[PDB]
Design an enzyme around this catalytic site. Structure first.
Site, PDB file in Angstrom:
ATOM      1  N   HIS A 128       0.562  -1.501   0.286  1.00 37.94           N
ATOM      2  CA  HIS A 128      -0.236   0.257  -0.069  1.00 37.94           C
ATOM      3  C   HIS A 128       0.180   1.283  -0.327  1.00 37.94           C
ATOM      4  O   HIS A 128       0.268   2.026   0.233  1.00 37.94           O
ATOM      5  CB  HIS A 128      -0.896   0.002   1.142  1.00 37.94           C
TER       6      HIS A 128
HETATM    7  C1  LIG Z   1       6.591   2.859   5.738  1.00 37.20           C
HETATM    8  C2  LIG Z   1       6.102   3.921   6.907  1.00 37.20           C
HETATM    9  O1  LIG Z   1       5.890   4.822   7.174  1.00 37.20           O
HETATM   10  N1  LIG Z   1       4.236   3.430   7.537  1.00 37.20           N
HETATM   11  C3  LIG Z   1       3.638   3.519   8.665  1.00 37.20           C
HETATM   12  C4  LIG Z   1       2.440   2.897   8.995  1.00 37.20           C
HETATM   13  O2  LIG Z   1       2.515   2.362   9.372  1.00 37.20           O
HETATM   14  P1  LIG Z   1       2.349   0.662   8.533  1.00 37.20           P
HETATM   15  O3  LIG Z   1       3.584   1.022   6.878  1.00 37.20           O
HETATM   16  O4  LIG Z   1       2.516  -0.081   9.081  1.00 37.20           O
HETATM   17  O5  LIG Z   1       0.818   0.464   7.929  1.00 37.20           O
HETATM   18  P2  LIG Z   1      -0.007  -0.460   8.158  1.00 37.20           P
HETATM   19  O6  LIG Z   1       1.503  -2.008   7.280  1.00 37.20           O
HETATM   20  O7  LIG Z   1      -1.053  -0.960   7.241  1.00 37.20           O
HETATM   21  O8  LIG Z   1      -0.499  -1.695   9.422  1.00 37.20           O
HETATM   22  C5  LIG Z   1       0.072  -2.286   9.833  1.00 37.20           C
HETATM   23  C6  LIG Z   1      -0.300  -3.296  10.941  1.00 37.20           C
HETATM   24  O9  LIG Z   1      -2.221  -3.654   9.708  1.00 37.20           O
HETATM   25  C7  LIG Z   1      -1.745  -4.923  10.337  1.00 37.20           C
HETATM   26  N2  LIG Z   1      -2.963  -5.336   9.254  1.00 37.20           N
HETATM   27  C8  LIG Z   1      -2.436  -5.544   7.732  1.00 37.20           C
HETATM   28  C9  LIG Z   1      -2.930  -5.169   6.519  1.00 37.20           C
HETATM   29  C10 LIG Z   1      -4.345  -6.731   7.450  1.00 37.20           C
HETATM   30  O10 LIG Z   1      -5.101  -6.852   6.480  1.00 37.20           O
HETATM   31  N3  LIG Z   1      -4.708  -6.913   9.155  1.00 37.20           N
HETATM   32  C11 LIG Z   1      -3.577  -6.243   9.869  1.00 37.20           C
HETATM   33  O11 LIG Z   1      -4.553  -6.539  11.015  1.00 37.20           O
HETATM   34  C12 LIG Z   1      -0.542  -5.220  10.667  1.00 37.20           C
HETATM   35  O12 LIG Z   1      -0.416  -6.604  11.360  1.00 37.20           O
HETATM   36  C13 LIG Z   1       0.508  -4.605  11.337  1.00 37.20           C
HETATM   37  O13 LIG Z   1       0.250  -4.413  12.631  1.00 37.20           O
HETATM   38  O14 LIG Z   1       2.013   4.113   9.621  1.00 37.20           O
HETATM   39  C14 LIG Z   1       2.593   4.028  11.177  1.00 37.20           C
HETATM   40  C15 LIG Z   1       1.772   4.416  11.863  1.00 37.20           C
HETATM   41  O15 LIG Z   1       1.232   5.712  11.632  1.00 37.20           O
HETATM   42  O16 LIG Z   1       2.047   4.406  13.371  1.00 37.20           O
HETATM   43  C16 LIG Z   1       3.471   3.783  11.234  1.00 37.20           C
HETATM   44  O17 LIG Z   1       3.916   4.081  12.629  1.00 37.20           O
HETATM   45  C17 LIG Z   1       4.824   3.335  10.636  1.00 37.20           C
HETATM   46  N4  LIG Z   1       5.953   3.823  10.185  1.00 37.20           N
HETATM   47  C18 LIG Z   1       7.260   2.864  10.161  1.00 37.20           C
HETATM   48  C19 LIG Z   1       8.766   2.935  10.084  1.00 37.20           C
HETATM   49  O18 LIG Z   1       6.976   1.324  10.286  1.00 37.20           O
HETATM   50  C1  LIG Z   2      -0.311  10.417   4.072  1.00 41.23           C
HETATM   51  C2  LIG Z   2      -0.645   9.143   5.002  1.00 41.23           C
HETATM   52  O1  LIG Z   2      -1.547   9.254   5.840  1.00 41.23           O
HETATM   53  N1  LIG Z   2      -0.609   7.382   5.037  1.00 41.23           N
HETATM   54  C3  LIG Z   2      -0.560   6.501   5.525  1.00 41.23           C
HETATM   55  C4  LIG Z   2      -2.435   5.634   5.503  1.00 41.23           C
HETATM   56  O2  LIG Z   2      -1.774   5.340   4.175  1.00 41.23           O
HETATM   57  P1  LIG Z   2      -3.666   5.724   3.658  1.00 41.23           P
HETATM   58  O3  LIG Z   2      -2.662   5.068   2.052  1.00 41.23           O
HETATM   59  O4  LIG Z   2      -4.505   4.506   3.207  1.00 41.23           O
HETATM   60  O5  LIG Z   2      -3.523   7.046   2.949  1.00 41.23           O
HETATM   61  P2  LIG Z   2      -4.484   8.068   2.867  1.00 41.23           P
HETATM   62  O6  LIG Z   2      -5.449   8.122   4.848  1.00 41.23           O
HETATM   63  O7  LIG Z   2      -4.680   8.762   2.291  1.00 41.23           O
HETATM   64  O8  LIG Z   2      -5.993   7.253   2.703  1.00 41.23           O
HETATM   65  C5  LIG Z   2      -5.634   7.085   0.475  1.00 41.23           C
HETATM   66  C6  LIG Z   2      -7.413   6.410  -0.031  1.00 41.23           C
HETATM   67  O9  LIG Z   2      -7.450   5.084   0.800  1.00 41.23           O
HETATM   68  C7  LIG Z   2      -8.992   4.838   0.398  1.00 41.23           C
HETATM   69  N2  LIG Z   2      -9.632   4.182   1.893  1.00 41.23           N
HETATM   70  C8  LIG Z   2      -9.079   4.507   3.282  1.00 41.23           C
HETATM   71  C9  LIG Z   2      -9.144   4.716   4.434  1.00 41.23           C
HETATM   72  C10 LIG Z   2     -10.414   4.360   4.442  1.00 41.23           C
HETATM   73  O10 LIG Z   2     -11.028   3.305   5.549  1.00 41.23           O
HETATM   74  N3  LIG Z   2     -11.294   3.951   3.327  1.00 41.23           N
HETATM   75  C11 LIG Z   2     -10.889   3.771   1.772  1.00 41.23           C
HETATM   76  O11 LIG Z   2     -11.180   3.513   1.221  1.00 41.23           O
HETATM   77  C12 LIG Z   2      -9.612   6.476  -0.145  1.00 41.23           C
HETATM   78  O12 LIG Z   2      -9.315   5.799  -1.268  1.00 41.23           O
HETATM   79  C13 LIG Z   2      -8.060   7.026   0.518  1.00 41.23           C
HETATM   80  O13 LIG Z   2      -8.921   8.633  -0.624  1.00 41.23           O
HETATM   81  O14 LIG Z   2      -2.587   4.436   6.323  1.00 41.23           O
HETATM   82  C14 LIG Z   2      -1.645   3.837   5.386  1.00 41.23           C
HETATM   83  C15 LIG Z   2      -1.470   2.512   7.357  1.00 41.23           C
HETATM   84  O15 LIG Z   2      -3.099   1.401   6.247  1.00 41.23           O
HETATM   85  C16 LIG Z   2       0.143   3.738   6.541  1.00 41.23           C
HETATM   86  O16 LIG Z   2       1.089   3.364   6.150  1.00 41.23           O
HETATM   87  C17 LIG Z   2       0.525   5.193   5.521  1.00 41.23           C
HETATM   88  O17 LIG Z   2       1.798   6.027   5.733  1.00 41.23           O
HETATM   89 CL   LIG Z   3      -2.095  -3.314   3.150  1.00 40.40          CL
END
Ligand SMILES: CC(=O)N[C@H]1[C@@H](OP(=O)(O)OP(=O)(O)OC[C@H]2O[C@@H](n3ccc(=O)[nH]c3=O)[C@H](O)[C@@H]2O)O[C@H](C(=O)O)[C@@H](O)[C@@H]1NC(C)=O
Ligand SMILES: CC(=O)N[C@H]1[C@@H](OP(=O)(O)OP(=O)(O)OC[C@H]2O[C@@H](n3ccc(=O)[nH]c3=O)[C@H](O)[C@@H]2O)O[C@H](CO)[C@@H](O)[C@@H]1O
Ligand SMILES: [Cl-]
Ligand SMILES: CC(=O)N[C@H]1[C@@H](OP(=O)(O)OP(=O)(O)OC[C@H]2O[C@@H](n3ccc(=O)[nH]c3=O)[C@H](O)[C@@H]2O)O[C@H](C(=O)O)[C@@H](O)[C@@H]1NC(C)=O
Ligand SMILES: CC(=O)N[C@H]1[C@@H](OP(=O)(O)OP(=O)(O)OC[C@H]2O[C@@H](n3ccc(=O)[nH]c3=O)[C@H](O)[C@@H]2O)O[C@H](CO)[C@@H](O)[C@@H]1O
Ligand SMILES: [Cl-]
Ligand code: NA
Lengths: 363, 359
Positions: free
Chosen positions: A207
């Protein structure tokens, strides 16, 4: 006695907040207010986490999401400020590096409310990443910086942040994995429903904006996953931004060549990570989670913040430049293990964090 | 062609953009686009600068001001983002350290538009000041840093920002004083209508949040300035923020006891600065400007970003703790002077900047 207001917006922030909130709720000197910006709003991205991790309903839900950086951040900034003037907290806790994080910090710091950053000091060194902007600006806006790794400590010191404001507490997402592990193992039947066994699949999540917003990068990824799938089933819970981009770019069809799911809950996700032959991700948290469960990982990025995973050889970078190489890298690394090593603390990060908040005193 | 988009909101920023635009206007391979955030809106805080400094009409005016930090910053972030999406510049220039400055940078960095900070690396180390937060976040968001001073440079290096992104160009507000001095001479008649003799008065401006929002600090200042006025007339262009806080705390009589003006245009102000015996201010610009004209300055703060002025003995810090102490400090300092020394460069900061941007 002391009021601590947390700002969360997106999935990874509810998981961190779950762990820290548990300790803060239980602490006597401490009333908590939780503000949910509305950044993540689909039930499988937000609601499910509150339910399955047993987090109480937010005290506020600002209902802001789906906009540009400028809309979301800007509207969050104003609305959070509103809550803060009413609630007048002693601390604002912000988490990670979402647009919600930066909005929270900016709201607070101009009101002279102390901000504590949970997961502080991570750097990609890639400023094109919005999350790099967010963590840099958040960290420099913060009064306490709760760093998860020694790398993160060193990053903050290099940016001229005083040592007295930095605390190495490890990672609350390790606290969360430890704590919720038994519940996952008891309640998830995702393996059953998919008809999968231990080590008979690869888990994938993608993502990062830099992967999803560029048609050719995304194609490279979906196609490499499909090829990989022919040799080892690929399970792909698909982020809502990733689905929207795949569809817009006409890449829909590639999702049929794998086991593509909607976003799953944390409990299901634990089980998938735990039982995978390999994790392939562009996620921050998943990289570490793979390591928790001693599963080899491949990160589909030009860089990671979690550099210790590479040194330890649990993780391996493979930028998506061609599907041939990416597929090969994946299938090769499927056979690897990193070295034995403890990272991320003892699973009581949240306890250390709580203590430092209660005992800092008035300036 | 390179499109350089300037974001300005407040009085000090118009004055800097004035110097920088004149250079870019007349530069080959540069289109300038100016956005006005609307942060300062009053004719005597905004329009008068465009008029008297010959700054072109803004391509956009976002009409945002007068609210909270959150409201102003938040709406400017969304609005500025709107313009950038339509203009797609190669650079965003931000100036100084107002809420407009931060919004501007933050809007731009997320679109991957490079941001240059004009007047980068100043530090008060008073983390509570909204201007410190602004310049810190902005410096860390910027790709180019145009430091006006050697300390500003050392500040950046200490915060881990690499040398190859930091250019020491001096101060565009020096450029502006040079360029417009002449015009201030011919067009200003403020001494005439106020009926002041050259070197027949002391000039004061006060508007820092930490002086205005704190009743007792504001009380000490307007008290102290009124006592100064018994001895030497005090001329006091009153910032709108200051006027409102003074009125709010029922301190308005101290204003009537001195020669209290609405804000004045840059031309009048140059006259007033030049012809004052000493300048009393918590302004940033006005303390440099005082040194420009070799008028001794007293800075009514616990610190300054422009430390070189203290060191050169042209400026003297006087914290507002006590009306009588403050007034004696003022009256004392007015028969002082600082050393022979050239700061802030040659009057060609604007061109040095213009150069680094094409390169
Ligand atoms: C690359 C980046 O900057 N990332 C930042 C970003 O998080 P992230 O990249 O981990 O997004 P994300 O993978 O959606 O969630 C993971 C969780 O989803 C769970 N997870 C994942 C997929 C799923 O289907 N279901 C589920 O439970 C997994 O089990 C897992 O626990 O936003 C975070 C935040 O602001 O707190 C920052 O701490 C991060 N910074 C860092 C540096 O890791
Ligand atoms: C800029 C920012 O804060 N980015 C964070 C955001 O990404 P993420 O890609 O979700 O960032 P946004 O919150 O801007 O959502 C992007 C797009 O996702 C779609 N959308 C989002 C949420 C939802 O419930 N439904 C839906 O459809 C919408 O089209 C929206 O515009 O969350 C991620 C975790 O999951 C993090 O890793 C990213 O760092
Ligand atoms: Cl994901
Ligand atoms: C302390 C602080 O953070 N200050 C920041 C602040 O400027 P500042 O404090 O100088 O505000 P200000 O004093 O109203 O304007 C001065 C001008 O008004 C003229 N001036 C003044 C009064 C008047 O009646 N008429 C008039 O023309 C004077 O001739 C003079 O030219 O915003 C600036 C910006 O973001 O660009 C930052 O660069 C500053 N940072 C620094 C470090 O100086
Ligand atoms: C937070 C911020 O950016 N502060 C800057 C702003 O201060 P300044 O005090 O002007 O900050 P604001 O722009 O928030 O304005 C404060 C208040 O002044 C009043 N108002 C302002 C402008 C106007 O044309 N008319 C009017 O009446 C309104 O009541 C407004 O709410 O500009 C100064 C230059 O002058 C800078 O030194 C300050 O760093
Ligand atoms: Cl003023
Ligand atoms: Na509690």
């Amino acid at each position: 006695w002391v009021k601590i207001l947390s700002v969360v917006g997106a999935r990874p922030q509810f998981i961190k907040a779950a762990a820290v909130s548990r300790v803060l709720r239980a602490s006597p000197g401490v009333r908590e207010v939780l503000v949910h910006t509305g950044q993540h709003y689909d039930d499988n991205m937000s609601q499910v986490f509150f339910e399955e991790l047993e987090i109480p309903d937010p005290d506020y839900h600002l209902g802001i999401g789906g906009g540009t950086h400028g809309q979301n951040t800007g509207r969050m900034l104003e609305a959070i400020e509103g809550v803060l003037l009413k609630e007048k907290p002693d601390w604002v806790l912000v988490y990670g590096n979402t647009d919600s994080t930066l909005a929270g910090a900016l709201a607070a710091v101009k009101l002279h409310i102390p901000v504590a950053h949970v997961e502080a000091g991570l750097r990609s060194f890639n400023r094109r990443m919005p999350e790099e902007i967010n963590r840099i600006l958040t960290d420099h806006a913060s009064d306490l910086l709760f760093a998860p790794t020694e790398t993160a400590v060193q990053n903050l010191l290099r940016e001229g942040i005083p040592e007295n404001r930095i605390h190495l507490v490890g990672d609350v997402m390790y606290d969360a994995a430890l704590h919720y592990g038994a519940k996952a193992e008891r309640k998830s039947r995702i393996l059953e429903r998919l008809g999968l066994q231990a080590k008979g699949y690869v888990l994938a999540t993608i993502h990062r904006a830099e992967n999803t917003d560029d048609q050719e990068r995304l194609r490279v990824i979906l196609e490499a996953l499909a090829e990989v799938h022919q040799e080892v089933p690929v399970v792909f819970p698909v982020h809502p931004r990733t689905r929207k981009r795949a569809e817009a770019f006409g890449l829909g069809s590639y999702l049929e060549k794998v086991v593509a799911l909607e976003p799953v809950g944390y409990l299901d996700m634990v089980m998938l990570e735990k039982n995978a032959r390999l994790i392939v991700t562009d996620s921050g948290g998943v990289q570490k989670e793979a390591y928790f469960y001693r599963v080899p990982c491949v990160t589909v990025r030009e860089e990671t913040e979690w550099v210790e995973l590479l040194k330890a050889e649990w993780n391996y970078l493979a930028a998506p430049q061609n599907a041939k190489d990416l597929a090969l890298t994946i299938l090769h690394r499927m056979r690897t293990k990193g070295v034995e090593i403890d990272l991320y603390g003892d699973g009581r990060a949240s306890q250390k964090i709580s203590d430092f908040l209660r005992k800092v005193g008035i300036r």
